């Protein structure tokens, strides 16, 4: 019976493990993709996928759910879960692999996570997930600024001084408050000093002298 | 990574760096900040710490 | 004449028959693989290694490399596979007193017809050229050019009974008829002298087997398992040797060997590019046994 | 590969007049399996025969002896000796023997000792018989262009364009003279009626079947001579239909659903013909109701039926000539005279029946 | 060794079209949009043309164009001196 299947899915989800609960939730979803009583099963399936490392399946379930329900009372949880799946895709040290720092790696997932957490905080600031979303936005902004700093460090090592000043200018425009922009201000001063402009190097030295850390 | 109440990846709602604005030295200004990566102020319920209540509604 | 010289002369004639058994055992694995895939097309290549042992301190190792071209054809109510194979065999065999090193070049034409009724016929014709250089205690057998030619035809008739959507039973009977050129040896030394001569002999091998395949397809962990129990027995056996020397006349009986073969194969693909293979082949109850060739290979892509 | 084939060798035999295989002569080296309308054509008891590679041999009708013999390497580079690839059929008149080729050359050769009287270049490849009438030789080319040539110089010239589909059928209908008008077929399944000395009188008539696209025309190409009898022309498309058309209106058609790709013979009431599915039959002149059908030779690629001594003679692709009774439609005789097969028009004229095999061997057969 | 190219491509014939009191849009039409600019206070465009062919010396030309706040060029500074 479907009520028996939902109760065994909830007991396997709470007492057991998410792997044993995905198959039980999938048994409800296969009968009712567009069928009735399929909306709480989709939210249970989204949590079960996220906790099972099935991040593309969790994102596909979230996309199905936000198309089937454009407005719902728990839409804040769905918006938090998209940024949370993208944050778990960044840090792709998952499934048996790890990396020492992953700031250098593709920031596309981190940008999607930052966009979803911001859209949640400016849409629903009264949710229980607002403080965690704001902390994840601070960490994601530090990760994006560290990526643009790693790109500025490479171009400094290669000798691409116009690329280095254009990168540090992009970092000052987009991430003025991050530690990586302070780390990058020396690179912008060095890149101007390697060129025939010392007035810009004096301006960057004045910015560093005013406050850098 | 962790498959318990803690994150499927690693902690980003606890681990972070404080953000501090740069001062504008006299006789010049900092680059105009027109990025879309602005962080809105938080005024909701705190959920930070070991507790992370992410059970599906 | 010397006991060693007699053992070395018997070992030189027995190396052919062992190489012929080893090449037939390596060759049947292609037909097995081609049937378990249910047909393929284009170019293929396989590599095999094995070890055999016989009483009297006889141990042989063999590396076999097969290259070939296969073609799938639909005709009547049967699937027809027709192909051409070139094989290279590198073999080393030691009698305690006599050791040989053999290079073999084989050319074969094979055809497998799989009928929709649940049956198959495999026919292969093979010509193998064998060059051997060897070591001998005295210069009479010496170290020198030894060239032989082997022609053999293998015919396997079997049935495929699917007892489940993922489980099969294959009862099969294979007959291999070989022809090897007659031979005889007289010692080269002028201080020691003896002559060993064997009758021309055609080794014909009959094999009856029942293979059992089972699959355990998990959520993503495809597991293919097969097991086979066969019996290899001489129907036309090795020639009997006649030795004449300063100790007179004697007759040494040819090999008549019967052995039970146990084969186990496992292929477990846990994920994309993450796989575990295992092969086990073991013979027993013959004077010559194919010994434990069990190997496992785990290949994990990061 | 393997085909169903669908062809059964006919076993029954009644050679009451055992066919004499006589007066044989290998012409060239053969036409081969290449499609050709080459055929031995005779006038004056002199057979003019031709093979691919420019090989014209005149012959004796009462023997294999040759009255004239020639080979052609002209306008393809004399030094080169390039293959003319003759493929229009010999048609003889005026002291001139007209042969078309797949090098776009019509090579009129004189009856006396093979003088090349006029190699006229025509637009496209000639693959039709060159039917001469009114002092104009009319040649239909595979480019879909009907070309007229004067008997003396090939200088008289007019081009008529007939419709060409993207996938045509090979073979080009014969221009048949009727009232000094050539009632030509065509590859768009259209029986044109071009007047001679004019590009006009074209009552374009659609006789193509309408099923499918390119099953209208590439299935159905009129490649048979439009036979004129009683002032009415008859034409057949390959899967299309025999379509009787008058010569005074041209827009009225009555038909039975029957197609052919080889020539057919009308002797008054009966349109003896062979269907593109290899079946012999005799049809009524009015309507097309089957008077009799001999369906024994399915898929053997028979050749144009000829009336000889009251028997309908056909040749299969296995080299069997088959005499058929015209009253009931049963075999009177069968004989193999070749092993390379026939795919060329036989001629029955001057009391002689001649067939040219795929190897260029000309066989003369007496009933 | 890799060739390092940086900045805008400057020609001796198109830098001569630039004159004092020119609108910044006309300068951007004549030499293209500057890759390097002053992001600190005063609007100043830096047309650098820097070539390093791996081994050979650095070819550096610095064209500093100081724009008035209204958008008219006030101070061409052309340094063809190498770095």
């Amino acid at each position: 019976p479907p009520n028996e299947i939902y109760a065994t899915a909830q007991q396997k989800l709470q007492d057991g493990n998410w792997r044993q609960a995905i198959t039980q939730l999938e048994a409800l979803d296969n009968r009712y993709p567009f069928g009735p009583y399929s909306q709480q099963v989709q939210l249970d399936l989204i949590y079960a996928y996220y906790k099972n490392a099935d991040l593309p399946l969790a994102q596909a379930a979230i996309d199905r759910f936000i198309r089937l329900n454009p407005t719902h009372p728990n839409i804040d949880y769905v918006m938090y879960m998209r940024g949370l799946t993208n944050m778990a895709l960044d840090d792709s040290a998952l499934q048996g692999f790890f990396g020492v720092d992953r700031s250098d790696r593709d920031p596309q997932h981190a940008r999607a996570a930052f966009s979803d957490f911001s859209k949640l905080v400016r849409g629903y600031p009264n949710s229980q997930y607002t403080t965690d979303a704001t902390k994840r936005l601070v960490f994601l902004k530090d990760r994006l600024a560290k990526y643009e700093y790693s790109v500025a460090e490479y171009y400094t090592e290669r000798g691409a001084w116009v690329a280095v000043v254009n990168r540090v200018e992009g970092m000052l425009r987009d991430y003025p408050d991050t530690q990586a922009t302070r780390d990058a201000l020396p690179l912008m001063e060095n890149a101007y000093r390697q060129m025939q402009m010392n007035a810009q190097a004096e301006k960057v030295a004045k910015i560093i002298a005013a406050n850098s850390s | 990574s962790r498959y318990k109440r803690q994150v499927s990846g690693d902690e980003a709602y606890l681990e972070a760096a404080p953000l501090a604005e740069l001062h504008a030295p006299a006789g010049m200004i900092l680059p105009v900040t027109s990025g879309d990566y602005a962080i809105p102020v938080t005024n909701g319920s705190g959920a930070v710490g070991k507790a992370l209540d992410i059970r599906p509604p | 004449a010397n006991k060693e010289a007699t053992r070395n002369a018997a070992a030189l004639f027995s190396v052919d028959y062992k190489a012929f058994l080893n090449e037939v055992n390596n060759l049947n694995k292609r037909m097995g693989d081609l049937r378990d895939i249910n047909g393929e097309a284009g170019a293929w290549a396989r590599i095999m290694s094995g070890t055999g042992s016989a009483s009297g301190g006889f141990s042989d190792n063999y590396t076999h490399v097969q290259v070939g071209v296969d073609k799938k054809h639909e005709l009547d109510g049967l699937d027809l596979f027709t192909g051409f194979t070139v094989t290279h065999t590198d073999s080393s065999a030691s009698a305690d007193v006599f050791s040989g090193k053999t290079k073999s070049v084989g050319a074969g034409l094979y055809a497998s017809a799989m009928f929709d009724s649940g049956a198959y016929i495999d026919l292969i014709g093979k010509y193998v050229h064998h060059d051997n250089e060897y070591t001998a205690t005295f210069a009479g057998l010496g170290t020198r050019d030894y060239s032989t030619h082997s022609w053999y035809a293998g015919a396997e008739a079997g049935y495929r009974y699917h007892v489940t959507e993922d489980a099969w039973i294959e009862p099969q009977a294979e007959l291999v008829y070989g022809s090897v050129s007659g031979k005889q040896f007289a010692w080269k030394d002028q201080g020691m002298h003896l002559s060993m001569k064997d009758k021309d002999y055609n080794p014909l091998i009959g094999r009856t087997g029942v293979d059992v395949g089972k699959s355990f397809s998990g959520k993503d962990w495809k597991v293919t398992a097969r097991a086979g129990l066969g019996y290899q027995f001489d129907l036309l056996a090795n020639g009997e040797t006649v030795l004449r020397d300063a100790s007179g006349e004697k007759r040494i009986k040819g090999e008549k060997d019967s052995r039970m073969l146990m084969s186990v194969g496992l292929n477990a693909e846990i994920r994309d590019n993450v796989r575990f293979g295992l092969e086990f082949e073991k013979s027993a109850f013959g004077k010559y046994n194919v010994d434990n060739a069990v190997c496992a290979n785990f290949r994990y892509s990061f | 590969e393997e085909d169903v084939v669908k062809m059964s060798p006919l076993p029954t035999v009644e050679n009451q007049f055992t066919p004499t295989t006589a007066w044989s002569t290998s012409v060239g080296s053969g036409i081969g399996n290449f499609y050709s309308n080459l055929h031995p054509a005779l006038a004056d008891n002199v057979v003019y025969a031709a093979d691919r590679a420019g090989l014209v041999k005149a012959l004796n009708a009462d023997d294999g002896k040759e009255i004239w013999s020639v080979s052609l390497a002209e306008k393809d580079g004399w030094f080169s000796k390039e293959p003319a690839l003759l493929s229009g059929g010999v048609t003889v008149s005026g002291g001139h023997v007209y042969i078309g080729s797949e090098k776009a050359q019509v090579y009129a050769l004189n009856t006396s000792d093979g003088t090349v009287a006029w190699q006229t270049k025509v637009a496209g490849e000639a693959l039709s018989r060159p039917v001469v009438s009114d002092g104009l030789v009319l040649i239909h080319t595979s480019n879909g262009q009907l070309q007229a040539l004067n008997e003396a110089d090939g200088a008289v010239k007019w081009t008529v364009n007939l419709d060409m589909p993207s996938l045509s059928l090979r073979g080009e209908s014969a221009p048949t003279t009727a009232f000094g008008a050539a009632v030509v077929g065509g590859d768009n399944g259209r029986v044109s009626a071009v007047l001679m000395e004019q590009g006009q009188m074209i009552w374009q008539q659609r006789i193509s079947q309408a099923t499918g696209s390119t099953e209208i025309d590439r299935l159905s190409d009129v490649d048979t001579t439009p036979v004129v009898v009683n002032g009415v022309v008859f034409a057949l498309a390959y899967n299309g239909n025999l379509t009787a058309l008058d010569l005074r209106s041209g827009q009225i058609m009555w038909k039975r659903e029957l197609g052919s790709v080889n020539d057919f013979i009308v002797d008054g009431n009966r349109i003896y013909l062979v269907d593109q599915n290899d079946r012999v039959m005799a049809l009524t002149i009015d309507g097309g109701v089957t008077l009799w059908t001999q369906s024994d030779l399915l898929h053997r690629l028979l050749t144009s039926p000829v009336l000889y001594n009251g028997n309908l003679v056909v040749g299969d692709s296995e080299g069997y000539l088959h005499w058929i009774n015209v009253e009931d439609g049963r075999f009177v005789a069968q004989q193999k005279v070749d092993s390379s097969g026939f795919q060329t028009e036989p001629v029955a004229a001057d009391g002689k029946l001649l067939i040219q095999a795929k190897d260029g061997t000309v066989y003369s057969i007496t009933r | 060794r890799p060739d390092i190219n940086q900045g805008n491509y400057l020609t001796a014939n198109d830098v001569s079209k630039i004159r004092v009191g020119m609108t910044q849009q006309q300068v951007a039409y004549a030499l293209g949009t500057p890759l390097m600019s002053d992001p600190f206070g005063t609007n100043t465009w830096f047309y650098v043309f820097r070539q390093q062919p791996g081994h050979e010396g650095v070819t550096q030309q610095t064209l500093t164009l100081t724009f008035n706040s209204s958008g008219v060029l006030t101070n061409i500074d052309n340094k063809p001196a190498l770095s």
Partner: protein, 785 residues
């Protein structure tokens, strides 16, 4: 009663609109019971319905129709080589599949639609009789009767209207040909529309490059034989006058570069017109504009024809747009690969003028890294300005690099462990990690190799390898010895040019030589070393710590991987032992492989190979016997057993040889020959010279499609190996051989055949000059080359 609306049910492939016309009753009719039975019978008799139910539900006819039986089985009876599986899947892809109702009118429609389709694509297959066979319970059997006529083959390809060229010249470069491939010619007998279009485009390109600028194809007739087995292709072509180039005028916006653009054009009078020369001049002008940063030029060349003077002149409209400047280089789809790994391969610099050639060189560098499945490039014009570009590289990460763990257990063999970890991008960095391990009862190997490309941003490679080898003295001694050699090498390599690379480095090597057989060449070195081994006794322990300076050079320019056809690869590897080691020596090795094509098709290739090696000691020391050179075998001097060309051991009377099958064993082990004995086993030499000359043919009988995978070759090999420190002396065994002059010469046939087991090479060799002691090997099998 009166009909207001008529409805129909479940018509997935069936037509609802037609059903109202096929029903005699219309909307606005009046029905009685008799009419309802008559409409049910008419709708069943359309041929498209099995159950017809008509309800008079008030005044609306609810017609619930059940369609004809669903497709259940399709029967396959194809013979003749028809590839029946393709034909059934093609019928399913072009029409009905499973779950599609199959009607009884569709018996004629499938035969007719298959006939149209064959005539439409040209080549005629025999029509399939897709008869619909009725079965009970709403199921149907589709019995496909195959006539099986097949593969209508090309019979003649006729060029009509050519009077200045031979037909075979034009036929030779067509995809479709009547020719049967033996080992040089090619040809497709199958008919294909796309191949005919390609053949017509190659025919125009030929006639345009032969000087004809008025070449027109008036028509192309493709005709089908009535037997349906032959296809004819005739092309009506008209030639023009011979045109000679007089001059090229270039007009437009050349951006001041006329003194460079106009020197790549203006072909001197007396050259014939060529179309591909015009395309090459257009692309050279586009590349020259790209070099100045013009990445969107418009170069259009049009010909001015003169039929009075019989000439062609060219007008080249050159419109050079704005210079494009790269603003951001973005790498997207690299989850594990560090950005520095992708960005250091860039030859397009960020903040610079856009070079399309530089972007494609960056893309080729990312492709030849091997870390990505597909690497693409997106020239995104940045929103808002004309002269700005973002170059976005889309990449797909690979799981390249694997952990292979093998374990075996035999009866003559204990546990034989093998382990191999190959990891490119280790930790997602640019580091490459190779770990090898082998455990066996007669062999223990371990290696850890860590390589960093781009240690310095110029492109230098810093590698470090830690190796441990341990070989036991096995029974049946062949000069074999208990060797344990372990050490660490650090190597810094730097590219001094895009084809020349130089290498330098240091290596620490320890050796442990134990259980060595009494033999002259080894002891000549050991005596040079302080140790004087006990003359009769096999017991030995030689331990050396060697600090070697390693150097090398590589000139690599080869047109393609696996089967190079042109260019040269020269490798030089040498080592000098620096002061502070136990033994001091020097080695030089030079490998040269030069492929010279003697044809424009690149099949007739002459391959010259040279392997030279030399090495002596420093001062009074000799070169170590375990670092000597060996020749013979499949890589070098084919036709001899591996390592048998060179000096042979001269053995002293031994005491223990373990057990050799031979009673003699090695020289005088137990009693035996008192005089020194001549080995037939190679001990290696101080110097070597090998010269190979190979001839290369297209495959002697192979499908050209596979000719790239199969290199067929013939070969003549020469090899000599000799000692440089051999002092002449009177022995009873091996003759004094310090002469490089004895050469072993072999000749034969070599096959290279790609396989899913890697490059597999097979060769048959006949040694036609060999010396005594040398072994002969007639058949060679190997991997690589």
């Amino acid at each position: 009663f009166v009909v207001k609306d008529i409805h129909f049910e479940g018509l997935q492939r069936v037509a609802v609109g037609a059903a109202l016309l096929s029903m005699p009753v219309r909307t606005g009719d009046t029905v009685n019971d008799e009419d309802i039975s008559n409409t049910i019978r008419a709708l069943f008799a359309t041929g498209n319905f099995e159950d017809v139910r008509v309800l008079r539900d008030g005044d609306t006819l609810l017609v619930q129709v059940k369609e004809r039986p669903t497709i259940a089985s399709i029967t396959f009876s194809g013979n003749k080589s028809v590839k029946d599986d393709m034909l059934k899947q093609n019928l399913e892809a072009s029409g009905v599949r499973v779950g599609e109702s199959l009607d009884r009118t569709t018996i004629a429609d499938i035969e007719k639609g298959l006939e149209d389709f064959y005539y439409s694509v040209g080549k005629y297959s025999a029509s399939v009789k897709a008869v619909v066979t009725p079965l009970p319970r709403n199921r149907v059997d589709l019995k496909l009767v195959f006539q099986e006529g097949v593969s209508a083959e090309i019979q003649q390809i006729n060029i009509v209207g050519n009077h200045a060229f031979t037909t075979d010249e034009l036929i030779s470069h067509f995809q479709l040909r009547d020719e049967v491939p033996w080992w040089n010619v090619v040809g497709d007998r199958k008919y294909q529309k796309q191949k005919l279009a390609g053949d017509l485009e190659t025919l125009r390109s030929y006639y345009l490059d032969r000087g004809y600028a008025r070449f027109n194809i008036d028509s192309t007739q493709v005709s089908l034989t009535p037997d349906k087995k032959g296809i004819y292709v005739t092309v009506n072509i008209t030639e023009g006058d011979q045109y000679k180039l007089s001059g090229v005028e270039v007009s437009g916006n050349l951006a001041g570069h006329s003194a460079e653009i106009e020197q790549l054009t203006k072909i001197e009078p007396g050259e014939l017109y060529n179309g591909t020369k015009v395309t090459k001049m257009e692309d050279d002008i586009k590349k020259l504009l790209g070099r100045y940063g013009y990445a969107y030029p418009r170069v259009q060349s049009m010909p001015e024809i003169n039929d009075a003077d019989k000439t062609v002149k060219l007008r080249v409209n050159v419109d050079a747009g704005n210079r494009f400047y790269v603003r951001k280089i973005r790498f997207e789809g690299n989850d594990t690969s560090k950005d520095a790994v992708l960005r250091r391969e860039m030859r397009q610099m960020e903040g610079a003028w856009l070079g399309s050639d530089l972007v494609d060189q960056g893309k080729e560098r990312l492709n030849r890294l091997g870390f990505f499945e597909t690497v693409d490039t997106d020239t995104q014009r940045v929103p808002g300005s004309p002269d700005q570009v973002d170059v976005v590289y889309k990449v797909k990460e690979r799981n390249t690099g694997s952990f292979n763990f093998g374990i075996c257990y035999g009866t003559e063999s204990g546990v034989s462990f093998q382990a191999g970890v190959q990891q490119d991008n280790w930790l997602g960095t640019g580091y490459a990690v190779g770990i090898n391990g082998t455990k066996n009862d007669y062999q223990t190997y371990a290696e850890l190799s860590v390589t960093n490309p781009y240690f310095t941003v110029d492109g230098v490679s810093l590698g470090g390898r830690l190796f441990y080898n341990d070989f036991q003295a096995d029974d049946a001694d062949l000069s074999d010895y208990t060797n344990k050699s372990y050490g660490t090498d650090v190597t810094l390599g730097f590219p001094i040019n895009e084809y020349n690379s130089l290498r330098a480095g240091l290596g620490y090597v320890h050796n442990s030589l134990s259980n060595m057989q009494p033999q002259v060449a080894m002891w000549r070195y050991l005596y040079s070393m302080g140790e004087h081994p006990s003359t009769s006794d096999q017991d030995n322990s030689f331990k050396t710590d060697d600090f070697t300076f390693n150097y090398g050079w590589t000139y690599n320019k080869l047109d393609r991987g696996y089967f190079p056809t042109d260019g040269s690869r020269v490798n030089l590897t040498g080592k000098v032992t620096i002061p502070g080691s136990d033994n001091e020596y020097y080695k030089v090795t030079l490998d040269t492989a030069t492929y010279v094509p003697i044809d424009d098709d690149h099949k007739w290739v002459v391959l010259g190979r040279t392997r030279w090696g030399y090495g002596d000691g420093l001062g009074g020391k000799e070169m170590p016997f375990y670092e000597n050179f060996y020749a013979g075998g499949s890589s070098t001097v084919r036709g001899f057993q591996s390592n048998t060309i060179g000096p042979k051991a001269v053995y002293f009377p031994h005491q223990a040889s373990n057990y050799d099958p031979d009673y003699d064993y090695e020289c005088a082990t137990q009693d035996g020959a008192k005089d020194l004995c001549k080995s037939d086993d190679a001990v290696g030499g101080n110097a070597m010279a090998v010269a190979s000359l190979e001839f290369i043919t297209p495959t002697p009988f192979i499908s050209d499609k596979y000719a790239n995978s199969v290199r067929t070759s013939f070969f003549w090999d020469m090899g000599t190996v000799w000692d440089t420190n051999w002092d002449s002396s009177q022995y009873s065994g091996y003759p004094d051989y310090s002469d490089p002059s004895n050469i072993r010469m072999s000749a034969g046939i070599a096959l290279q055949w790609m396989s899913p087991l890697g490059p597999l090479v097979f060769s048959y060799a006949q040694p036609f000059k060999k010396y005594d002691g040398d072994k002969a090997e007639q058949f060679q099998f190997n991997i690589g080359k």
